[PDB]
Write a protein that binds this ligand. Structure first.
Ligand SMILES: O=C(O)[C@H]1O[C@H](O)[C@H](O)[C@@H](O)[C@@H]1O
Ligand SMILES: [Mg+2]
Length: 402
């Protein structure tokens, strides 16, 4: 039940206790980032590549019946027109634009293509490979029947009505989610040697997806319609694992949301409940670094656990959420990771969930470090988003002079 012991985020690798925010920021945070890079996700080999190019391919000022401006942007990772790229979809609420104010942004990757997040027939159909599990796909390619096929996870009209822009990119633009996807990924292009077997500490899909989120943020910093200092990075499940790693590595993200990210996301690995290190690496060998396989059936040897990933978001707001029936993600483990990260949030004057057991369903708990568990199976629902929008309202207010 409790057959593990966690490393203390506030004890340095040399045993010295971290007593102050400066030691956390300038020594302990780099230590932990290097541990997760080497042992779990793999190294992010560079941040912004030189020669990133942003091309707005479509712009509609009266999308969604006039409610939004919709922009599609190709973010190309080098100057040569042949360089790899990703396709960003952005809806911005026209009520905010009309007031001549920059909108805060929710940014997250999608599972099956930009055209799946909303029925809107003007969104470009992805030309990229799509998994067999994608609704209404045909031989691994998008079809018009797939439009809006993942819209329940994306309540665009509500987010816009609440004053937030919505930005998304298909994860498969960055690394196709298939065990062979790394060879057709931006990793195959970025700081790679002669294309053979990747190195032990080389990043995999989660690292690549996370890097893509930071490149989307680079684009948002240039877009006059949005406030790139108020970007909430979010993800569901495997894309929440990526949102957490993006938010931990890139402290420009103003707020981070993990929706049911489970093993190698928010859930403690040392708890051995639901999905385990061996199970995740065996089924998804491209997700983590090869070095993470050292801990298959040996989670006791992990030098970190996921509470320390959560702690890397501090002092910025972080929301971890679970589903009651989602045993595979280990909801208790996700909550206990929040509780074990809370001392770092407290060092920074924030507060986490009250209580030392999982709260009752649909009752969020915590300040800037917040948790809820909703009824039902794994997914991302309107109820999850209602809670996330309330959190963002509290923790993403436009900055005024201090
Ligand atoms: O992406 C999802 O929904 C989930 O898919 C699989 O079940 C995987 O085992 C999980 O780690 C992941 O979170
Ligand atoms: Mg688990």
């Amino acid at each position: 039940h409790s057959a593990y012991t966690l490393p203390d985020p506030l004890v340095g690798a040399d045993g010295t206790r971290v007593h102050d925010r400066a030691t956390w920021q300038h020594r302990r945070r780099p230590e932990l980032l290097q541990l997760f890079a080497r042992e779990v996700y793999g190294r992010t080999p560079l941040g912004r590549p030189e020669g990133m190019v942003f091309k707005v391919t479509t712009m509609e000022h009266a999308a969604l019946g006039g409610a939004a401006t919709r922009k599609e942007v190709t973010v190309r990772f080098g100057r040569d027109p042949n360089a790899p790229s990703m396709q960003l979809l952005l809806y911005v609420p026209n009520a905010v634009i009309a007031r001549a104010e920059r909108a805060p942004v929710f940014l997250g990757l999608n599972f099956y293509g930009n055209h799946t997040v909303h029925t809107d027939p003007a969104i470009a159909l992805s030309a990229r490979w799509i998994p067999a599990e994608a609704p209404n796909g045909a031989n691994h390619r998008a079809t018009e029947a797939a439009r809006g096929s993942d819209a329940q996870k994306w309540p665009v009209e509500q987010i816009l009505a609440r004053g937030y822009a919505v930005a998304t990119v298909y994860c498969g633009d960055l690394c196709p989610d298939r065990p062979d996807g790394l060879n057709a990924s931006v990793a195959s292009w970025l700081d790679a040697a002669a294309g053979d077997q990747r190195a032990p500490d080389a990043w995999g899909a989660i690292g690549v997806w996370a890097w893509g989120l930071s490149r989307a943020l680079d684009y948002l910093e240039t877009d006059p319609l949005v406030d790139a200092s108020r970007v909430a990075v979010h993800g569901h499940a495997r894309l929440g694992k990526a949102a957490l790693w993006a938010g931990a590595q890139d402290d420009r993200f103003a707020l981070v949301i993990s929706n049911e990210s489970g093993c190698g996301g928010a859930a403690l690995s040392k708890r051995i409940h639901g999905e385990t290190v061996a199970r995740i690496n065996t089924v998804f060998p491209h997700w983590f670094a090869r070095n993470f396989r050292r801990y298959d059936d040996h989670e006791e040897a992990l030098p970190v656990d996921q509470h320390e990933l959560l702690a890397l978001v501090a002092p910025r707001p972080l929301y971890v959420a679970s589903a009651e029936d989602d045993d595979w993600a280990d909801p208790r483990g996700e909550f206990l990771a929040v509780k074990a990260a809370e001392p770092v949030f407290r060092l920074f004057g924030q507060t986490g969930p009250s209580g030392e057991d999982v709260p009752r369903v649909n009752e969020p708990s915590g300040g800037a470090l917040r948790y809820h568990i909703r009824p039902g199976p794994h997914g991302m629902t309107a109820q999850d988003w209602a809670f996330y929008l309330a959190f963002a309202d509290e923790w993403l207010k436009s900055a005024l002079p201090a």
